[PDB]
């Protein structure tokens, strides 16, 4: 008897391959037997095996995040699928295309207390934009058309704007092993069963009129740019700002701070200097153009929120609604490059004055220049790491930035610079979970060196993710910023309420992470100065190697030091202004 | 200028305490500040701080599994809550009561791209029997009544049969820090705002007629008994099987293989000998009574499923539907003790024939007796562990058993004995996830020694759960069964196909676990013999102390040796006959 | 002191008006007080009061279908909202924008057995693309920004492609009456709080290459056009068929059969003649281009489904996936006009051969000519009503076509003609529910005459929808095709199993509908010939006026007369073809 799984799943897997899927992250199980095996057999899909399904999730995340096209993510029936939940959520908010396949029992064994079986229908709720429970396998030509169409449709839904996770629950009946000598991947058509052509979203010159006029009329504007992934969008946003002569508050994930592009318009110190009331009044713009999601900067958020008379224009091609201020005045569902090209074409020919832009460049330059006069030697002040690391991230490598303080410190401390490198971070939901695995995935995805900057609780959180270093031979340099607990919470007003603060917020572990390096076969460094940090820090991607570089820092004293440093620089700016 | 959070959340947490909540498992975060601070400040609730929310969830699972009453599980907004999903699923199917509180942002900050904010409504779907999005804090008498009522209700729901997880999403608005010096816990009533009294379920004399008739008139019955947690139900199920003279196929989770109760009726080798067609025909029963969920034994499942003419009577007080054979003939939603007694009170004085019982005892005695003559010295054969460890587990302690082969090996090799101890396992959904933390929770829950028997892939899966040892000073003995990979898959007929087997199923980590022991401050042992295993093995609960005992075994040769051993004790049974 | 509801809900309703809402369909209730009163008081919103929520829902459906922009749909707490489900489902599949607002009890009165309170959270599941449970009313400036933003957002989501229903559940605390003397609609800005600019989707020249290339090369192509709304799209689809010389199988809902456009390419008898295997064999195309949802024609479906080697190109601007054949070869997520212009731009100037097209025009013309010769005098044969009615539908009016046989008969017997009028049908889910109220709403919507052709079970189903005639003074001409039961089931192979058929499928009512006309103050006709019909039939929209025109037909003999009549025409075609 032919087993219907051979050609049904064969066709399913083959069609994903035809769709451009080149990678599959697979977690072991018996029930998922045919999905796994057939991904392995298929010559166009590379299989990455991961034991911990939570890490597996964030690994696929990182992979897909790197290439901006989907990867398969496969597990067996039971709590295995439930473990994907954190990564699916992050993928949903970050708009990362993932195709989740979960094996399931057939109907006669569901909802009746069979071993390892759970309700997998709509498991991920609305975090996935497409869900289906595939038909029990069948061999008819009509059902093979159905299964290939399902695969294409799933891949198509993942890549369709609001890119995100999709979910196919795959019930499978016993005899699970596909017959690999019976052309399981056999096709009827020459190429793709169905090719899916998704498109760009545009808003025309005319409906854009209100916005063009307010931009034509406002000398005082600023562009706020969060996470960016498109080169074209970056070139065009930069061009747009020169045409308007508006400064760009550039979030680190925007990657406008680091590159050979023109940066005269780029402002990198705003998170610090905008905490001052007086500089805010001075730099208050009449109009704001936002690109991408909200920047990391809390002071930019508070600024737009607490001053709603500032007219915000929000550009989001995907047509979502990302504006926690409730104060934005225009929500524009337009490709960033189309939007910028249209505005530029509508402006008059006269080069605008750069006076307004100069105020910003003045405040920014004077801020950074004063910071330079303040010592960065002390490795135990957490801030200094970033003041040093910015200059050392090798050209064309990736920097994966942990949540909690590291993404805030990168924002605070990274100045604009001429060397290309990519900053990545899990900013859809800001989890400290699966960060190691995301960085691992990014590495698989880019095939270039990756540095991961990460706090100790986060590191601990995804210790399991280090398995990929050896098991998959994935090179990674981890900069572990270890202040033994949750350093971010020291910034809360409630940090003085000391009877509970340490138990419930500081939460130290006391862990010696050199044992984690050994566990996962990585090398270990614990530099006591930047000279020896520089000697230790050498990311690479030519061969396997896990390098843990641990920096011990003092969370109990960092807040006052941090604030004195910045306040002192802000104070200097105000003095220069008065000259 | 009062913060409404002070008394609103104060009243919320205080009421949980009034309901009998004594433990809160708490994961750090900003938005959950009042939840965590108030649990900490309240004199009746012990706080257990966990960093890894996935671990935290299984830690709470184990705590509530040990006590059969709800604990609080708390986290802040975002992917934190999503990390509770695996434990919530297991609690759902194991029927473990847990009250999940997830901090959220307020409305003006939801669904709008705010930092760390996710859609938390109905987060766990129907794995939870009760969900609500609680009101934004307000301090009026009416809303304080509402909030106290919600806590009790949440508590009551988790304990209402099918016990299980419940979820309250708690949106909170800045000023987050409650004012501790302003009587946050103040009430209007002397005790509980609302006391919830749930009850036992009963089916009456009449409705049990057809069933009590068939049992009376059937000589050839067996009782299948999986996981049980009731002392009364255990006694009565035994009483019952004496009155009828039916054998009891005791799943390890029934715990009927290890206690002071009478065990003449208890059968423990069935999973092994029922693999033979001939012994099955000899011992084919007319009627089967089931208590608890499905036993671990696949052969018992396949028996009832492939011989549908065997009449099954399934007893389930919770009214669930656990029977993947699709062939049971009576589903009875009645308390196990009430059912047993009603069946017994309707039996005549006609002292029952025990030949049928004796056929079972014969087969069990002969199986065990022959196996005993087989050498157990080789530490590298996985089965031997359980053959030795059975006699070593301290009295009044707990053995937590990992999924995959360990629960199966416990089934195969644990014989009935008089030494009392409890066996636990995550058999709701058989995950290899969070097993270490569940054992950790059981230890906290019982304040008695705990031994965890776990395979290597599962141990790696919840390495992070070991943090509880130093951070919470919970003692634990871990017997790490390391065969470097997924040993269970070797039993599959598809293990023969070699090109992919190892990659996709074997999946070795090659991890050296001594480094893990160092990481979490545990003492390490790697005994080459049962003598040094004995010296190393010393579970205790008086002080902190993590002990990792690694047994290296060979999965490549394990199956063939396992089958020989067993097929030989079966052959020997068929001859003694 | 002040009631929060006054400015909270006031700001909510005012912002909907600022969004473009001009109509609110409202159902009475106590808990929905502020919603209904404030809509009533607002100068830009017309309130339409419907008692039966199910009718209300379909009425809102027709109103929004007519104008292609959203309306408010409002009811109190409880089963009232559950009665919107059928309309919401139809709006979802038909892609009709509706903003559904449901009043609710406050938290302290929910899930605790309070009178009339049900769980309204996610009431409509995923039939709505946006749902929220709004905050309890508050008066703070931040919450008035939140609620105005919510109104904009709800409106924006209903109009955002795949247009459809959205749901806001509105919990309200008692004292419910807003203070109308305290400027409930007061703004913080001049004009819209946020303006939402949706755009259009385009695929660029380059990713259209393969499809353009195959279309330039395929002589034998066909365009299949289902429900259309855009005038630009019609013009461009027609232009494209001439550039390519492809016939357009024009579904009645394309409205390509009844307008001033060039119809030289329009094929109208395909549903009939494509039932024949030999004509199918002769007219088989290599490529198919689909616009709009699937047509009504079952024969076209089965054709495309059973010959998967016919290469289909489906254009769907909204990004959905409408193809029940599982056989399509390309899904293009692109504006139809844009797609059309791109293909035309890539075509050479060379004369396109018209022989292929002439085969189709020949078949169609011969079919229709032979049908001309078959008499239509018999008012008891249902087909005839449509052969007569097509020339009688007043120019610039609407024909709303009931589901079941009417839509099929319209497809069968409406030929192309130069007279303009619009045909509407609820083809989203094909329900026989709410058709009257839909019609009523199309009349409110177009401010022009509406004719409704509907079968008797359907007409019975929404008898309540006729209240809108008296109560709301809406004129409607109802052509009631009464065959006493489910006429359509006679085409089933199972109409022979007489032992259960009449009981389960025929389902006669015996109802004398003149009582219904009387109940609702309508005038009644029962024409015995087409002459009496031509005399009674006079759709208008200047005054109130409900006209019920009943046609009694015989479903027992219909099928054979129908099939004989069409097969006769088909056979004439083949004869003619041989000459
Ligand atoms: C999965 C998850 N759980 C909890 C949180 C709440 N949270 C935000 S920051 C933080 C502490 C992070 O500590 P660490 O990684 O050491 O960085 P640090 O604060 O020391 O810079 C926590 C627990 C979260 N963001 N994600
Ligand atoms: C969370 C989860 N992922 C995957 C599975 C599928 N599964 C069942 S047993 C097993 C292998 C476990 O290996 P180990 O703990 O070493 O036990 P062994 O098979 O060697 O006895 C797997 C992957 C599961 N049950 N749960
Ligand atoms: C709400 C609903 N219920 C049932 C159906 C199934 N259905 C399709 S046609 C039909 C019969 C309708 O009869 P009628 O309106 O008299 O038109 P006729 O069939 O006589 O052409 C039914 C019940 C449906 N489409 N919608
Ligand atoms: Mn830290
Ligand atoms: Mn193992
Ligand atoms: Mn009818
Ligand atoms: Na492969
Ligand atoms: Na406490
Ligand atoms: Na009005």
Residue numbers in the entry:
A (entry chain D), C (entry chain A): 2 to 580
B (entry chain C): 2 to 578
Task: Show me the paper's own sentences about this structure.
MenD shows the three-domain architecture typical of ThDP-dependent enzymes.21 Sequence and structural analyses place MenD in the pyruvate oxidase class of these enzymes, where domain I contains the cofactor pyrimidine-binding motif, domain III binds the diphosphate, and the central domain has variable, often ill-defined, function. Oligomerization is essential for the function of ThDP-dependent enzymes, with each active site formed from two subunits.
We now report the medium-resolution crystal structure of the B. subtilis enzyme (BsMenD), solved by targeting the anomalous dispersion signal from a selenomethionine (SeMet) derivative. BsMenD crystallizes in an orthorhombic system, space group P212121, with four polypeptide chains, labeled A to D in the asymmetric unit. The structure was solved by use of single-wavelength anomalous diffraction (SAD) methods and refined to 2.35 Å resolution. Dimerization is essential for formation of the cofactor binding and active site, with residues from domain I of subunit A and domain III from subunit B forming one site (and vice versa, leading to two active sites per dimer). In BsMenD, the side chains of Asp457 and Asn484, the main-chain carbonyl of Gly486, a water molecule, and two oxygen atoms from the diphosphate group form an octahedral coordination sphere about the metal ion. Almost all ThDP-dependent enzymes have a glutamate interacting with N1′ of the pyrimidine; Glu54 fulfills this role in BsMenD. The active site is polar, primarily basic due to the presence of four arginine residues (32A, 106A, 409B, and 428B) and a lysine (299B). A hydrophobic patch is formed by Ile489B, Phe490B, and Leu493B.
